[PDB]
Design an enzyme around this catalytic site. Structure first.
Site, PDB file in Angstrom:
ATOM      1  CG  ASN A   1      -1.970   1.114   1.175  1.00  0.00           C
ATOM      2  OD1 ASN A   1      -1.887   2.035   0.371  1.00  0.00           O
ATOM      3  ND2 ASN A   1      -2.946   1.032   2.055  1.00  0.00           N
TER       4      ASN A   1
ATOM      5  NE  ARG B   1      -6.287   1.685  -1.098  1.00  0.00           N
ATOM      6  CZ  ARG B   1      -6.509   2.995  -1.085  1.00  0.00           C
ATOM      7  NH1 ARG B   1      -5.508   3.847  -1.254  1.00  0.00           N
ATOM      8  NH2 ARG B   1      -7.739   3.450  -0.903  1.00  0.00           N
TER       9      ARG B   1
ATOM     10  CG  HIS C   1     -13.798   1.048   3.516  1.00  0.00           C
ATOM     11  ND1 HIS C   1     -14.586   1.923   4.238  1.00  0.00           N
ATOM     12  CD2 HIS C   1     -12.518   1.304   3.878  1.00  0.00           C
ATOM     13  CE1 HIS C   1     -13.812   2.688   4.990  1.00  0.00           C
ATOM     14  NE2 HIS C   1     -12.553   2.334   4.790  1.00  0.00           N
TER      15      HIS C   1
ATOM     16  NE  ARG D   1     -12.269  10.292   5.551  1.00  0.00           N
ATOM     17  CZ  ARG D   1     -11.903   9.066   5.188  1.00  0.00           C
ATOM     18  NH1 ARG D   1     -12.447   8.495   4.117  1.00  0.00           N
ATOM     19  NH2 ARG D   1     -11.004   8.403   5.912  1.00  0.00           N
TER      20      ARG D   1
ATOM     21  CD  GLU E   1      -8.877  -2.874   4.529  1.00  0.00           C
ATOM     22  OE1 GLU E   1      -9.307  -1.849   3.955  1.00  0.00           O
ATOM     23  OE2 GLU E   1      -8.473  -2.871   5.711  1.00  0.00           O
TER      24      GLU E   1
END
Ligand SMILES: Nc1ncnc2c1ncn2[C@@H]1O[C@H](COP(=O)(O)O)[C@@H](O)[C@H]1O
Lengths: 395, 342
Positions: free
Chosen positions: A8, A89, A178, A239, A380
């Site tokens: 990632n 990713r 996601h 957020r 993940e």
């Protein structure tokens, strides 16, 4: 067994995990951070040991070099030839990618073309793909898109009610993110229940610093709460999630906010941090709330309410619910958040067992509940490693 | 009694005189005086109910133009004209019914100062409509409204949904302004907020242009490319226009998503009300909204729905589904009666 590395790459960082597959055992993991900045740091952990060094790391190329040299320098691999595949990713696959993809020249162009839709992530995601192709030329690589799982949404779920040309010419539509986490935990739920995912109506709640809800019916994503970008949907750490769109022109007129300041408002200043005035961290806000901070208590209540509203929309859409999944750093650990989200749901046959919820048991629904409620740790990187195996090592 | 319902549009003046109490009509800008009722667009947090028209009321209203600058001013002007100094007057606010929302329902997850210093929060509108049809429903069923968990759908050119539990509004879909919530005739309703900075950057849109986009070019009109009118879009979809068919499907999806949130919030549902030009007249919209809701005990009877009967749920259904014609002028006249001739 196979050795698969999950990568990632961020604007100034490189996260990595090395996994023994198919078993999914973690050989090592770590993080190179503040790349190109002062205070660049390289952390590397095995099961037994942790190594950490602050040192100059000019660019991602130097970051990858130091990582590969450390794999052999720490005796983790006898050779870089032991690496059987790499999964990367990628933030945004647009409509082009409905699944992970073998890395190749056309894949890379597509990912860079899509930089228009994720300008801060897709280019460095691809840079990481290029650096590994350069430094590990013989190792197959697979791109895993956070959007791909949601490419099964129907048009009445992804079209916004804007003029048609905003979708047709500008690409504006709900994509959702996601995807790797929702795919992973929903598959794990079905394995734990011993039933095919296609037999279940699932709502999946990934509650971490970023938060998203996903509805999964017939084995496919049919809705999810993040939209055009990961800013939207439910309330998160910094957020805002969804708000009244007419606020934004109001603020441009009143405060003269630039486009960049509007994004910063929505992404960095809002959410738990903006409401509580305390922290973006759920635990910090909860600590202040229990000490009497009324804004912090309101932040936590609004957080649960936004998630409940989204679950309700998706139960409606699917025509009922067979399972609710909690995952992410909050969903995995906060018995209190799960209790507030699940309260007063007898119209669904959904209630919690308090004892199971308090210890974060894998299944926390009450004895006579009709809905299964699962707490599943998301992984993940394992999901990415499984995509690498599937596409790079079919044998 | 003779009550005058006044709606001072910024270049118009709708009027109705009614025979109260039973509300028989004596219509205007003419068809076939104890008090006057004035539609007021925004009551802020100040007005939880209709108010007697006095000096205090009038400059509280004219202050709230800081939130409704294009409607409140001539609303208060219409009040000041009524030149009719002997007739008591009452201001009826489209926001007041929703002042029972709790903070979890009206606070946006923005920096706190946007609420605390600028008053940015969900207000909600169509308050007199939702109040009127929810009360009428309870009267038709012969129980207290506080006994029912109700979702009310006011579907016309403007569209909004409201959840009524314990006899009070507990959520509603329009927010800070009437632009937001579900998809409407020309208004987009809620969209991903991050779209807007993206458009400022990529297309150089000003705040004015963003407003025009959200309010005048989106919704049924923007998606269909045909019309902002539901029936026009329906005609085109029937003839094979794919965008028009998508517009109608998205329209129902947005309402269903909102209904689902409110059912979740209330912990169940006893009745669903359809009102407004679309809600009262479109069997198609109601059927598409009510599809596949057996998990709630909600199903429609096709014969009842086709003729827009007062109740259109299947006889085996648990949830009552009502089609009630809204009458905001009658509602305003009842407010006048209550506060000016008690
Ligand atoms: N033990 C815990 N209890 C509650 N929240 C937690 C806990 N550990 C981590 N979190 C939250 O998880 C979020 C980030 O998780 P993630 O981004 O999924 O790794 C932050 O808001 C943390 O406060």
């Amino acid at each position: 067994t196979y050795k698969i590395m999950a990568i990632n790459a961020g604007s100034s960082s490189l996260k990595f995990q090395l996994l023994n597959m198919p078993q999914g055992a973690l050989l090592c993991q770590g993080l190179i951070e503040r790349i190109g900045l002062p205070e660049a740091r390289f952390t590397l952990k095995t099961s037994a040991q942790k190594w950490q060094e602050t040192l100059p790391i000019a660019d991602h190329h130097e970051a990858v070099t130091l990582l590969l040299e450390a794999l052999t320098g720490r005796g983790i691999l006898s050779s870089l030839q032991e690496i059987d595949g790499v999964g990367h990713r990628v933030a945004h696959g647009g409509e082009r990618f409905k699944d992970a993809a073998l890395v190749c020249d056309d894949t890379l162009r597509e990912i860079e073309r899509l930089a228009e839709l994720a300008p801060l992530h897709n280019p460095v995601n691809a840079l990481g793909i290029r650096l590994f192709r350069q430094l590990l030329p013989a190792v197959p690589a697979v791109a895993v898109f956070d959007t791909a799982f949601h490419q099964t949404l129907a048009p009445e779920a992804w079209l916004y009610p804007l003029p048609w040309r905003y979708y047709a010419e500008l690409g504006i539509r709900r994509y959702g993110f996601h995807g790797t986490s929702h795919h992973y935990v929903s598959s794990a739920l079905a394995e734990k229940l011993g039933v095919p995912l296609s037999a279940l109506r699932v709502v999946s709640c990934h509650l971490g610093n970023g938060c998203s809800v996903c509805a999964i019916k017939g084995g496919q994503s049919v809705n999810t709460s993040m939209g055009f970008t990961p800013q939207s949907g439910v309330m998160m750490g910094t957020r805002s999630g969804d708000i009244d769109p007419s606020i934004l022109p109001w603020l441009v007129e009143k405060e003269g906010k630039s486009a960049q300041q509007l994004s910063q408002l929505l992404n960095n200043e809002s959410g738990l941090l903006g409401v509580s005035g305390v922290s973006s961290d759920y635990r910090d806000v909860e600590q202040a709330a229990d000490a009497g901070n009324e804004r912090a208590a309101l932040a936590l209540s609004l957080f649960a309410e936004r998630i409940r509203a989204t679950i309700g929309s998706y139960i409606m859409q699917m025509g009922g619910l067979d399972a609710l999944i909690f995952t992410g750093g909050i969903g995995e650990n906060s018995a209190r958040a799960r209790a507030a989200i699940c309260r007063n749901l007898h119209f669904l046959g959904l209630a919690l067992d308090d004892e199971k919820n308090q210890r974060s048991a894998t299944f926390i629904q009450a004895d006579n509940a009709l809905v299964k409620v699962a707490v599943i740790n998301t992984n993940e990187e394992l999901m990415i490693a499984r995509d690498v195996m599937r596409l790079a090592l079919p044998q």
